[PDB]
Structures are given as C-alpha cells and as structure tokens.
Design an enzyme around this catalytic site. Structure first.
Site, PDB file in Angstrom:
ATOM      1  CB  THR A   1      43.360  38.793  43.904  1.00 56.63           C
ATOM      2  OG1 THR A   1      42.438  39.134  42.865  1.00 56.63           O
ATOM      3  CG2 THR A   1      44.573  38.150  43.289  1.00 56.63           C
TER       4      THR A   1
HETATM    5  C1  LIG Z   1      38.216  40.102  33.315  1.00 56.84           C
HETATM    6  C2  LIG Z   1      37.310  41.348  33.111  1.00 56.84           C
HETATM    7  N1  LIG Z   1      36.038  41.239  33.836  1.00 56.84           N
HETATM    8  C3  LIG Z   1      34.900  40.654  33.128  1.00 56.84           C
HETATM    9  C4  LIG Z   1      34.434  41.501  31.923  1.00 56.84           C
HETATM   10  C5  LIG Z   1      35.874  41.664  35.189  1.00 56.84           C
HETATM   11  O1  LIG Z   1      34.770  41.538  35.734  1.00 56.84           O
HETATM   12  C6  LIG Z   1      37.029  42.267  35.948  1.00 56.84           C
HETATM   13  C7  LIG Z   1      36.783  43.387  37.016  1.00 56.84           C
HETATM   14  N2  LIG Z   1      36.688  44.659  36.399  1.00 56.84           N
HETATM   15  C8  LIG Z   1      36.201  45.767  37.097  1.00 56.84           C
HETATM   16  O2  LIG Z   1      35.845  45.609  38.267  1.00 56.84           O
HETATM   17  C9  LIG Z   1      36.105  47.105  36.445  1.00 56.84           C
HETATM   18  C10 LIG Z   1      37.008  48.216  37.022  1.00 56.84           C
HETATM   19  C11 LIG Z   1      36.732  49.554  36.431  1.00 56.84           C
HETATM   20  C12 LIG Z   1      37.540  50.162  35.467  1.00 56.84           C
HETATM   21  C13 LIG Z   1      37.224  51.429  34.936  1.00 56.84           C
HETATM   22  C14 LIG Z   1      36.072  52.105  35.361  1.00 56.84           C
HETATM   23  C15 LIG Z   1      35.251  51.496  36.323  1.00 56.84           C
HETATM   24  C16 LIG Z   1      35.589  50.237  36.837  1.00 56.84           C
HETATM   25  C17 LIG Z   1      38.035  43.411  37.910  1.00 56.84           C
HETATM   26  O3  LIG Z   1      39.063  43.914  37.489  1.00 56.84           O
HETATM   27  N3  LIG Z   1      38.004  42.863  39.198  1.00 56.84           N
HETATM   28  C18 LIG Z   1      39.186  42.847  40.045  1.00 56.84           C
HETATM   29  C19 LIG Z   1      38.821  43.282  41.443  1.00 56.84           C
HETATM   30  C20 LIG Z   1      39.747  41.398  40.052  1.00 56.84           C
HETATM   31  O4  LIG Z   1      38.923  40.480  40.181  1.00 56.84           O
HETATM   32  N4  LIG Z   1      41.102  41.105  39.893  1.00 56.84           N
HETATM   33  C21 LIG Z   1      41.635  39.720  39.895  1.00 56.84           C
HETATM   34  C22 LIG Z   1      42.528  39.335  38.739  1.00 56.84           C
HETATM   35  C23 LIG Z   1      43.905  39.296  38.909  1.00 56.84           C
HETATM   36  C24 LIG Z   1      44.766  38.925  37.828  1.00 56.84           C
HETATM   37  C25 LIG Z   1      44.222  38.597  36.591  1.00 56.84           C
HETATM   38  C26 LIG Z   1      42.800  38.626  36.387  1.00 56.84           C
HETATM   39  C27 LIG Z   1      42.229  38.297  35.119  1.00 56.84           C
HETATM   40  C28 LIG Z   1      40.848  38.326  34.894  1.00 56.84           C
HETATM   41  C29 LIG Z   1      40.004  38.684  35.958  1.00 56.84           C
HETATM   42  C30 LIG Z   1      40.569  39.009  37.199  1.00 56.84           C
HETATM   43  C31 LIG Z   1      41.967  38.995  37.450  1.00 56.84           C
END
Ligand SMILES: CCN(CC)C(=O)C[C@H](NC(=O)CCc1ccccc1)C(=O)N[C@@H](C)C(=O)NCc1cccc2ccccc12
Ligand SMILES: CCN(CC)C(=O)C[C@H](NC(=O)CCc1ccccc1)C(=O)N[C@@H](C)C(=O)NCc1cccc2ccccc12
Ligand SMILES: CCN(CC)C(=O)C[C@H](NC(=O)CCc1ccccc1)C(=O)N[C@@H](C)C(=O)NCc1cccc2ccccc12
Ligand SMILES: CCN(CC)C(=O)C[C@H](NC(=O)CCc1ccccc1)C(=O)N[C@@H](C)C(=O)NCc1cccc2ccccc12
Ligand SMILES: CCN(CC)C(=O)C[C@H](NC(=O)CCc1ccccc1)C(=O)N[C@@H](C)C(=O)NCc1cccc2ccccc12
Ligand SMILES: CCN(CC)C(=O)C[C@H](NC(=O)CCc1ccccc1)C(=O)N[C@@H](C)C(=O)NCc1cccc2ccccc12
Ligand SMILES: CCN(CC)C(=O)C[C@H](NC(=O)CCc1ccccc1)C(=O)N[C@@H](C)C(=O)NCc1cccc2ccccc12
Lengths: 223, 223, 223, 223, 223, 222, 223
Positions: A1
């Site tokens: 990000t």
């Molecule tokens: C949108 C949801 N999805 C698809 C189902 C994802 O894959 C997101 C990903 N979740 C995860 O990696 C899961 C984290 C977790 C939580 C509890 C137990 C184990 C692991 C993430 O946050 N990744 C982080 C590193 C990221 O990319 N963050 C960047 C980001 C910043 C602001 C707004 C955002 C909105 C949507 C997606 C990303 C966004």
C-alpha cells in the site's frame, strides 16, 4: 500500500494505489484506499483491509453525527483528535496483527490564509499525530520511496494540476520499488485513486485525468 | 520467483522471471534464475539467491568434472541423483532459512525416441525427486498460477515456438497473480530468461524473441 | 473445500464441492456447502463444518428477521455488512481453529442494469470484504486452482448454461489439484451443488444438469 | 500413500498407488512406490519421498552386493534383518520428520512348500518387523482401509491373477476413503503399480492388466 | 469403544460394545453405551464415560421436556440441533480430555416415505453434524474397522434382521482389530447392546437374539 | 551508515559518511567506511565496525596475496566471488548480531568497453551478490533515501565531477532522513570520504573538493 | 529527545529539542515537546509522542479544571501530586512500551523568597518525584549529556538571559552526542523550543531569540 498527500496553493491532494495482497499473493486490483470522510476531509489508510474500511466508515459517521447533533461541524483540530482517539482505541488489536494507520488530508475552512489552509496529518499505531509543515507525506509499505521522490519533485508544485502529477508520480516510484504497491495497469485500465480538496470541498479526481498523467510519466521514462 | 519448464516435440523449454525481493522491497530487476548447467541440461532455482546460485554453479562444475575425469558425461538419471544429493546436503541450512529448490530440464541423448527425449525433474527440500510425465512443471511462489495456466494452454504446444510462447505466458499469469514474480518491464526492456534444449544442445533464447512474445501476450489481453 | 461463483448475463451462479475430511480421511461424500440464504442470495462457506453451517443458518435467519420486522429486505450493501460483522465476531474462535470463510453471491433487485445485477463478494477472516468486479471468485483449499481455471474459461460465458458449465469445470480443476476438494463421483452419482440467481430468484440447479455437464467435461478431457 | 501385499497359492503380489501430496495439494500423479529389490523381492515404501526412494535404492544395492561378494544370495531372514537395521538406522531422522516405513514382499526359494513360500513382512519406525502369516498386509495412510477390505476379499484369492484383482481393489478402497492415496485415473490412464513374485522371480505386472482390472472394479460398483 | 448404526428398509439399527477401560486396564465388562433417548430415537456415545452418560441422560430429558411443554415432540431436525448444541457446549471441557462424541439414530415419523424414514446423524467435537446418506456410520476407536466392514456387508441388508446381523458383525470386526472395543464374551454371557427403531418405535433387542447372531458369526469365522 | 556508489562515463565513484553509533549515542564522528582494496577496486562496508574493518583488511590482504602468489591479479569476477565467500563465512556470527554488508566498486581493466567498464556489486548477509546494471547503488541504514535521491539526480551524471557531486548529495539526503547517517559537520570540518576509480586506478578524493561540494549543496537548499 | 530546565534568579526556564524518530528514521523536525500547562507551570515530556501529548493536554485541563471549580489554583505541591498520579496511572501501559516521563518547571507564587521561587520536579515511571535542589535537570535520551554540560555551565547563570543561553547550549551538547536529539537546523530555521517563567507568568521564548543564541554557540564552537 502507498498513500500520498501533498499541499498545493489553495488546497490539498491525496492519492493511493489499488493493489491488495494476502502475503505475496495479489488478492485485489481495484480496491479504494482513499475516502472522502466529509466535505473538507479525505482519509487514506494502510494496513488490514477490514480495519481500514472500518476506520473510514466509522469516522465519516462520527463527524457527520457531531454536525447533526450540534448544528456545526467540528473544528479541524477536533477532527484530528477524534481520528487519533479511534486509532488509539484499535491499538490492542493492532498489536495482535489488525494494524491500520491513516493519513488525513483536509482543508481548514477557519484557517486565516485560504491558500495554505490545506492540512496533512499523519498518525502512528498509538494515535500520536503530526501536522506536516513540510507540505507532503505518505504512509504504507512504499511510503519511503514516495516521500523521497516527492522530496525531489515538490518544487514543481505550483497549482492543483501540477500537484496531482507529483502525487501520481510519487505513487509510481513507490510501486516501482515496492511489490506491495500497485502501479498503473494499462491492460486493465486501473489507476491510482485521487481526491482533491480546496475551498469548494472534496472531490474525486476523475479516472481519465489520472490515466493521462500515468501515461505521461511512463512515456517520460521510456522515450 | 517463478520457474517454468515444458516439453515440446523434440525438445524442452525453461523460463524464469527477473525479480529479486527482500520482504516487500524490490531488490533486483535483472537477475538470472535459469542457468545452462551442461550442454543438455538447464537448472532454474527458486529460493534464497545465494544458495540458488551456489547450486547452479556447483552443479555445473560437478557434471563437467565427471565428464573430464571419466571421458563421458553422466547418464541423465545420474545427473538427477547428483542434484538430489546436493539438495539433500543443504537440508540443515534449508531449515534455518537458506532454502532453495531447483527445477531440472534436460534432453536425454540416450532416449529411444528423439522426440520424447525431453525431461523435466522436480525436487523438494529433502532431495526427493519426480520426473514429470505430464509435460510441464513450475516452482516458486507463482508456480501454482503458472501450472494452472499451462494446464489450459498446453494443448497448443506443437513445436519449439509455441512451447516457448506457452512458457512465457505462464510466467505472465504467474507475475500477474504473485507480487514476488516479475512480469515484463516494457519501460526498461527487461524480460524473462529462457533456455531451449533439443538434440543440437541447449541455447539461451535471446531477449528480443521473448520481448516479441511478451508484447504479443499483452496486446492479446488488451483487444 | 472449493466454492466458486461467477456472474453471467442477467444473473449469478455459485457451486460447491461435496467432500468433507478429517485430516486425510474422507469423512463425507455428499456434503452441501452452498446455501440459499434468501430469495435473492446464496452463501457458500469453507472451513470447519460446525462454524460454516452455523454461519449459513444464522445469516438466513438474520436477513429474513429484518425483512419481517421492517417490511422490506435489506439493501444488498446491508446484507454484505451483516455477513462481514458476523465473520468478524468469530475472529477469536477462528484463531483457535474454528475458522470459516463465506463467499456471497446475490442479485441486487435495486440495480439499474439488469444484465450486471449479479454480485459476488469475498471475505477474509477479519471480515474485510471485496465486491469482485472481474466476474468470478472462489474460496477454499482449491480456490486458487479454480480461479486460475476460470481466468482462462470465463470468456466462454454467455448465459446461465455456459456459466454453470464453466463453474463446474472450475470445480473439476480444483478437485483435480486439491485432495481436500471432491470431484464428481460417477460411481455414486454425487455431483457438486449449484445455485442460480436471476430476477426470478434463487433456485437450486437440478442434480441431473450438473451430472450432464460433468460427463461432458470428463469426455472432453479423455479424448 | 497405500501399499498392499498378499500371499497367493504359489506366489506373492504387491501393489501401490501413484499419488504424491504436499499437504492437501496433489504434487504428483505418476510416482512409483513399489520397487523390485532383487530377483525374488519387492519393497514398497510410504512416507517422505526422499527417504522412501533412498530406502529402496540402498536396500537393492545391499542385497545384490552381498550376492556378488559371496556368490550366493542372502536367506530371506537375512534380507529381513538388513531392512530392519536400515529402518532402525533412520529412526533419528524419522523422529525429526523424515519418516518412511517399508513393506517387504518376497518368495523364499529355500522354503519346502512352493505354495506357502510367499512372505509378507511389515516394519515399524524402530525396525521391529512381523512376518504376516494371515496372508496380507498394507502400509501407508490408507493401510487400515486396505487391510479391512482385504479381510473381506481375501477368500477370493486363488491364483496370482485373482490376488492381483484383490490387491488393486484394496487399493481402490484405500483411495476411496483416504485423500492422500490416489485411485485409478481413467482420464489420464494412470493406475497403481504391481509386482508379482513366484518361483520364476519377480516381474512388474503390465499396465494394461491393472487397467482392465480397475475398470472391472469400477463398472462392478456402478452397474 | 465402537458404536455402529445402519439404515434398513423401513427402519434403523444401532449397536454398541460393552467394554470400559482406564488406559490398558479393563474397568468394565457390561456397560451400556447405546441409549433409547425417546420413543423414536436412540443415541450411542463414545468417549469419557461420565460425559457420555450425562449427554444421553440430559438429552433424553431435554426431548421429553419439550414434548411435555409443547404437547408435541420436536421435529427430527430439531432433535439434531439440540444434540449438536449440547456437544458444542461441551467443546471446552473436551479439549481438556472430557471428550464425548454421539451417534444419533432415529425414525422420522414425519417423513414422506416411511420405508426410507430411517436417519443416522454423526457429530464432531465442535457440534458439526452430518445426516448420513450412505446408509451406515460408526464412532469410537474401532469405528474405522467397523465402517470398512459395513462397506462390504451392507449390500446384504434387506430388512431388520439382516441389518442387525451386519451391525453385530461390524462390532465383531471392530473388537477383532481394536483392543479398546470388547467382543462377545461367551464365558460371561456378555454381548453388545442393540436398539431397533421403526414406525412402531424404538426397542432394545433382547440379549438372546444378539447372542444368537454372535455365535453365528463366530462359527462362520471358524469352520 | 550510508555508502553510495555510482558509475560515470569512464569510471566509478564511491562515498561514505563518517558517523559511528552505539544505539542512539554518537560514538564516532570521523570514521572511514570506504577503503581502497586494490589499485582498481574500493569497498565500503555497513554494519558492526569490527566486522566491517576486518572485511576490508582481510579482503585487501587476500587480493594482494593471490596477486603475489600467481603473478597476476584476480579477474573481477573472482574478486566478487572472494568477497561473497567471505560474507557467507561470516553468516553465523551475523545471525548472532555481528552483521556487516559490503558494497564493491571497481574498474574492470579486462572489460570490452573502457567507457562502461565501471562495476558496482552489492551483497547480502548470505554472500549473494548482484551486479547493478542501473548505474548506482547504496548500502546502510540510509541507503533507501540515497537510492531514491539518485533515482532523480542520476540523469545529471556526465563526468567525474558531476558524479562525485551526485554521490555527495545522495549522502546528504541520507543523513537528512536517517539519524544513523552523519551529514557534513561544518563546525568540525568533517565531510564524507570518497574514492574515484578510472583507467588510471583508484584514488582518494581529496577532502577540499568534497567540502566545497557539500557547501554548494547546503547553500543550494537554503 | 532532550528536555532541560534550570532555575535562574527569580525564575525558571525549560527548553526542548524538535526531533521525532521511529527507530533510526527521523519522522519529525518541528515537534513541540515543552508545553505551558498553566500561567505558572510548564511541562516537557520525553517518550512516546501519543502519551507525552496526552499527558500535557490532560494535565493542563486538570489544573484549570480545579481552578474553575474551586475559584483558586492548586498549591504547587498539589500540582506535583496530580502529575505524579497521572504518571503512576500510566505505569501499566508504560510496561508494554507506551512510556513517557515528564519534567515539570514552575514558579511558586506562594513561595517565601521570590528570587528562588523557581521549582523543578522530575518523575519516574512509577510516579516517584523529586524536587531538584541543585538548580537544573533534564529528561530524555540526551539528558545525561545535557546534565553534565549544565553541571559545568550553571555558574554562568545570573539572570533569565544567561539561563536561556545555558539551556540552549545544553541542548546543543545533547544533540551533539545523541542522534535521537535534534540540534539547530540552520537550513530549515528550526530551533529548540523554550519557555520562561517568572512572577509575571509563563511565556514562550520567541524563536528569533533562540536562533540568535544558537548561531552564537555554533560560531563559538567553530571560530
Ligand atoms: C478486502 C478483503 N480481502 C479480500 C477478501 C483481502 O484479501 C484483504 C487482506 N486480508 C488479509 O490479509 C487477512 C488478514 C487476517 C485477519 C485475521 C486473521 C488472519 C488474517 C488484507 O487486508 N491485505 C492488506 C495487506 C492490504 O492489502 N491492505 C490495503 C488496503 C488499504 C485500504 C483499504 C483496502 C480495501 C480493500 C483491500 C485492501 C485495502
Ligand atoms: C542478489 C542478492 N540480493 C542483493 C544483494 C538480494 O537482495 C537477494 C535476497 N537476499 C535476501 O533475502 C537475504 C536474506 C538473509 C539470508 C541469510 C541471513 C539473513 C538474511 C534474496 O535472496 N531474495 C529471494 C527472495 C529471491 O529474490 N530469490 C530469487 C532468485 C532465484 C534464483 C537466482 C537469483 C539470483 C539473484 C537474485 C534472486 C534470485
Ligand atoms: C459434519 C461433521 N463431520 C462428521 C462427524 C466431519 O467430519 C466434519 C469435520 N470436523 C472436524 O474435523 C472436527 C474439528 C474439531 C472440532 C472441535 C475440536 C477439535 C477439532 C470438518 O469440519 N472438516 C472440515 C475440514 C470440512 O470438511 N469442511 C467442509 C465443509 C464446508 C461447509 C459445510 C460443511 C458441512 C458438513 C461437512 C463439511 C463442510
Ligand atoms: C517427489 C518429490 N516431490 C515433488 C517436488 C514431492 O512433492 C514429494 C513430497 N515432499 C515433501 O513434501 C517435502 C518434505 C519436506 C522436507 C524437508 C522440509 C520440509 C518438508 C512428499 O514426500 N510427499 C509425501 C506425502 C508422499 O507423497 N509420499 C509418497 C511416496 C512414497 C514412495 C515413493 C514416492 C516417490 C515420489 C513421490 C512420493 C512417494
Ligand atoms: C465410569 C466407569 N468407570 C469406572 C469408575 C471407568 O473407569 C471408566 C473410565 N473413566 C476414566 O478413565 C476416568 C478419566 C478421567 C476423569 C477425570 C479427570 C481425568 C481423567 C473411562 O472413561 N473409560 C472410557 C475410555 C470408556 O470406556 N468409554 C466408553 C463408554 C461410553 C459410553 C458409556 C460408558 C459407561 C461406562 C463406561 C464406559 C462408557
Ligand atoms: C569500534 C568503534 N566504536 C568505538 C569503540 C564503536 O563504539 C562502534 C560500535 N560498536 C558496537 O556497537 C558494539 C557491538 C557489540 C558486539 C558484541 C556484543 C555487543 C555489542 C558499532 O559497531 N556501531 C555500528 C552501528 C556502526 O557505527 N557502524 C559504522 C561503521 C561502518 C564501517 C566501518 C566503521 C569503522 C569504525 C566505526 C564504525 C564503522
Ligand atoms: C508524532 C507522531 N508520529 C508521526 C507518525 C511519530 O512518528 C511518533 C513516533 N511514534 C512511534 O514511535 C510509535 C511507537 C509504537 C506505538 C504503538 C505500537 C507500536 C509502536 C514516536 O513517538 N517517536 C518517539 C521516539 C519520539 O520521537 N518522541 C519525542 C516526542 C516527545 C514529546 C512530544 C512529541 C510529539 C510529537 C513527536 C514526538 C514527541
């Protein structure tokens, strides 16, 4: 990000990349990380997706809540304080891995000089905040490359348009040196998100403008 | 990292991306992960760079060493056993973080059928090996994506050129879904490395050929 | 486990495999993982069986509960939010092993364009959600294989019938490369479950049509 | 993994599945787990591939080494003892995760009665062995399903051919109830490997005969 | 412990062994592990004796409680849900060693087809349940031997008597291969307990019938 | 610590700061981190001081050792290999906290094109090395700031002088954003050290010219 | 961070540096660490920014709160106690890394001797406090160096101005020997912050005055 924000004469601009990952895997190409939280405020957030969107949503609701109860919007200092309190509230979960940091860009309508009324505020996981008096700031895994790029390009900022180009270019450098930050996808037509804020309010910058700036930078580095 | 290998009528192809990372940071854009280890075998390795390069270099030396001492090169099976023993030797360091897995592609001069003489062998961290009888294989963080791509495109492999195309496109999909794998950098002119092996030996595919294939895949996905 | 969902002109389709395991042991052959949660919504879930079924049941009850209390169903965004909040509530237990992720497929009756009114939303363990604008999505231990297959087959989707076939084929590839996902059992006559959702609502696809498609895929891949 | 062995009047037969996994992912479809270790002995091994293949290779070398040094092969008891000593030697590595168990099938040329000259010997991680006088034995993750199947089907063993059918069917049940064991792939034409041993020696059973028997079993359970 | 249950045309049967252990020591020879929990349902439980008996007792009490409060018995689905919630309620204590799993057999008087109204429901430690559509199921340390036996004997089940014999024989095989499961004690006159359930209700099979079947099985296995 | 190295037409330049710390405390203001290891190669090192100086010293000794034993210097590739093997040799101690990474700058006299004969090689804790085809590289706690600065300033490199200025300015930005990298001390008169390498060999850049360049950058940003 | 405070005839002065770090990275150049907490007391705090700013703000609020509730300001002893209590309240979070220590400088309006009415109070993480009878004190990562400098320069304190010069010079030495403390930035024009307190109250020292003193010190140390 990577989220970037910079002040230009009479306003502020914030832009963010579009890539979402789970570890090394790309799990999203179209995500929005920069949100207009009120008529004069935008928030860009880095970190856990659930927590980031929760921040943006809950914050917008809180601000407009105060405005409807009391008939007047919060002072900018007040807005900062509430965002900081929210972060500090998340600290416990953040230490177990649900960490998200915001970057705040606003236009202080009560500022004396409307040409430097733009405000850029950064936060840490404990809610500590700093108002950036040097004009630009970034947050996220590519924030160091982006800041160091803007350090060189900031003197070229003379209006909203040039500032927008510097923002997009800083995101380009970030994505160039950070695999967790997404550069422009010319095949799919996906480009960074931008919000511009001046005395008239906060507006989403249309995609096409960012696309033109992106192609301009790419060409500039090719030939 | 993504390394691919596929059999085509009369030969074998192996290709690898050009990206090196330290965590999320891009630490290299031009690296070489596929090495010609002898006149009829190439090795591509994923994992810690130092261990991978040491594998390729030491292995090539071992093969040519035997060839000069005994006046004849090893049978392909013997080459397999040597790479396996080398990998198994590293197991202890692999546990402590210095992990690297190779993918072996060769042309067996002693095979009965000069058209199915291609060989693709995969290894695990303990040296267990499998000769791939299904025509293609990949290793690295994007290897699952590359394999699933080749599963759909492999029916189009009829000669060296089409096989090389499927290989480069599998690398394209891999880099598309994995941030640790680098796609074609059209701005800097950096493309995957490829090695082709037939009865005449192993040759490096020139970068311009791969560049043509990359641009072909891109404007194929653009319309 | 593998659940797939894809958008087709005028609707959405979701399908899931039928296998239940305890480690390596096959503990179920006939399991249903895709549930119609309301007249215009289906949920398919991967993970611990107890938690998955509990999610489906409680979610359906919550939606219809609101619908009877307020005389109107939730907007689709509301359905998304409630599912996300439900997932987030379980985060604590999930961290101890009671982990389950849902995949949401729905038809938004309030959408302007009836052709693209299909909706597919994915969730992570923390409740973060993404509405997939690229047309398909999957979840489970075979989800990457299925996504990578649909990446190649999605252009062939023109109606509910072709979309259902691409879905079943995606599940076939998942079960092909994942031991935790079950393919079609032609000896027992057990095939994946599918739900179709269009303007007329959500209905279970009859087992016979899925059987027909499964045999078509098998026969095309054997010769 | 599942390896089966059974005694039949005048000989012994051993068969093994073809699946290789890394966790839930299928990493191999064609592996050979049953090796002819000498003119009258076959060994099948379950566990981590590197250690299993090393066992088979080294054991065969040891047996033939003694035979060439002393001009006469080991008694069957000696072969048992040497394999046992090898397993016990690997016990430490097995306790660190590099575990592999073999199953020994042989024909004792020095037995008085050529009908009961078949031998089936099982081993544990510490090298303890048992000569199975109940006629059959299996090893691997599916070995209990295979054993319990043979407990019902063993009365049908009247010659090498029927014994081969019972072996392949036991492997079929093992693959039916255990995801780490692979069943017959009628699409790819990949079936278990089998070795049969009688007074004339140990020979590999041809692919086509196992294929026939596999289809016989499948059509037997469908109708 | 081993509990078996299977469906036959028009009813269901459940049977359980009589052995109680503390580690290796036999601490009981006549215990009852299968309980008629209401007019049309029986439950057999494996695991810690105190927990198992409390499950059976409290469950029967809950069912008759609802029946007396509401003037009508629970639907079978409701019976399932209450048993599941009870198991899930015990989960915490289970992960400290007080583990018990039930196996539910019932006759659904509200089913459309009275000849397939038999029901067999299995549960895991988290309360997840599955209604067994394949005709038989077992639980306990000998459950895999019993299931693999019933897989072969189930084609012989045409009525209540054949179903009962198949069950008792499955328990025989379980006790044959599992030291924690007790076989028929011909010296003491102690045999498994069985419950039969059809449209007329659930009744305990008298000891004499079970002994008869036991002797039949023994002589079948001797000659 | 921050070490920078960049290629210019016909040569290479390397420069390093002068600060030594123990945690937050400044324990040194004048140290030298860039060493001429042979007539055509210089090495700059970041990390624990003891390991760094031992690397530089033992490396120079090893190269001259081969040169005197075999009557000819190592090929540049060989020099790379020996430095890498040294790092890999230190890996265990590095995992206990005594970590040091080098940055190698050289002029390849056996190169095909004398204009592009400059060479810059970076190393990681496992002995892995990469030859930089992109013209510049840095190592140390401020190396990200320095690299990102050079990414913008490198197009201005046309000769030895402009390259030396660009290097000193990258060090300036590094010290600007990194407390572990020391900037120019105009009170004490202490400036970064620099080594320049071309076909005539490797020489120390004299202090005066670096002092001038630093004061030019300072006055330029004020 | 370094905060210094010293008593001069008839008043007290407190000064602090302007640097903010995250590990080795400089995250701020203009931060304020010395706060006027009431007309006659100033507080400077070292440690994590969030806790420090919260301390200053909450403390000022508490003092003025008591003053408005009871119509009279707290005695100095009371002020000291409240701050001490506030710190002891933070002890728990301090143990987990959110540590901040304040340094209190005040003018006691009720003191008998007005020329020695200055007061300097230091605190530890458990709230223990000491009133410094030796005239000066410091807190932060550079406090050792600043204290040892003031130990030598304090005899030169004869009025408010000499005290201000000595304070600024102590900060200069601290920043000279500590990388976590920022010295005067002549390029950006950022200098330490200073507060002076006498009978007329507490006033911020204007930046130009401190800049004069800084440049004087630099010239003194160069020539
Ligand atoms: C949108 C949801 N999805 C698809 C189902 C994802 O894959 C997101 C990903 N979740 C995860 O990696 C899961 C984290 C977790 C939580 C509890 C137990 C184990 C692991 C993430 O946050 N990744 C982080 C590193 C990221 O990319 N963050 C960047 C980001 C910043 C602001 C707004 C955002 C909105 C949507 C997606 C990303 C966004
Ligand atoms: C060329 C070496 N450089 C620059 C100095 C790197 O930054 C490489 C990077 N080192 C590291 O990540 C060092 C990690 C480490 C090891 C031991 C102790 C402490 C820390 C790496 O291997 N990354 C892995 C993830 C990778 O990219 N692997 C891909 C790869 C495969 C085959 C041949 C390669 C050759 C060069 C570079 C990469 C190669
Ligand atoms: C239905 C219950 N049965 C029969 C007794 C099972 O064997 C299911 C199996 N339980 C377990 O593996 C038990 C895990 C556990 C619970 C508590 C404490 C320690 C460990 C499972 O969920 N396996 C997971 C990996 C799985 O198969 N997941 C697939 C799945 C997804 C959505 C809905 C489902 C409904 C029924 C069965 C499976 C379902
Ligand atoms: C053949 C090599 N390949 C492809 C690169 C594999 O994926 C095999 C797989 N290695 C692994 O899973 C790696 C084990 C390991 C070692 C060190 C550190 C961490 C993990 C395996 O043994 N799997 C087990 C579960 C297995 O399938 N065992 C079955 C088996 C039995 C007898 C002979 C065999 C020969 C080849 C493959 C399998 C064989
Ligand atoms: C209660 C009957 N008696 C005599 C006092 C026993 O010794 C049974 C034995 N207790 C124990 O082993 C005590 C274990 C324990 C309890 C608390 C804390 C730590 C450890 C048992 O559970 N055995 C298990 C392995 C078992 O046999 N389970 C089978 C079983 C199933 C359903 C109903 C049953 C009723 C009576 C006996 C067994 C029953
Ligand atoms: C030897 C110079 N002195 C004075 C006695 C120092 O205090 C340096 C400081 N020692 C230490 O930090 C001690 C390390 C240690 C080892 C074992 C157990 C506990 C602690 C240091 O290395 N600091 C590192 C962070 C550093 O500043 N590194 C910068 C640096 C790079 C290349 C060549 C250098 C030569 C001299 C000094 C520094 C050099
Ligand atoms: C001002 C907020 N920002 C901008 C994003 C910072 O980077 C501050 C920095 N946060 C951190 O270091 C974060 C520490 C943390 C908290 C929770 C979980 C994990 C880690 C800091 O406090 N650094 C300490 C070492 C420091 O410099 N402290 C100096 C200091 C003293 C009194 C008042 C201050 C006000 C603003 C800034 C600094 C202040």
């Amino acid at each position: 990000t990577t989220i970037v924000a910079l002040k230009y004469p009479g306003g502020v601009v914030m832009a963010g990349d579009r890539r979402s990952t789970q570890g090394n895997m790309i799990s999203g190409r179209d995500v929005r990380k920069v949100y207009i939280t009120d008529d004069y405020t935008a928030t860009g957030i880095a970190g856990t997706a659930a927590v980031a969107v929760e921040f943006a949503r809950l914050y917008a609701v809180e601000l407009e809540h105060y405005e409807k109860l009391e008939g007047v919007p919060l002072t900018f200092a007040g807005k900062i304080n509430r965002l900081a309190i929210m972060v500090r509230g998340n600290l416990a979960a953040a230490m177990q891995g649900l960490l998200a940091l915001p970057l705040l860009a606003g236009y202080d309508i009560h500022a004396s000089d409307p040409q430097s009324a733009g405000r850029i505020v950064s936060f840490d996981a404990a809610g500590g905040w700093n108002i950036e008096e040097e004009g630009y700031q970034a947050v996220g895994s590519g924030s160091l490359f982006a800041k160091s790029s803007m350090k060189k390009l900031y003197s070229q900022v003379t209006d909203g348009d040039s500032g927008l180009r510097v923002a997009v270019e800083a995101l380009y450098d970030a994505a160039d040196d950070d695999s967790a930050t997404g550069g422009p996808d010319l095949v799919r037509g996906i480009f960074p998100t931008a919000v511009i804020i001046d005395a008239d309010g906060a507006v989403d910058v249309p995609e096409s403008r960012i696309a033109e700036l992106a192609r301009a930078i790419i060409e500039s580095r090719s030939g």
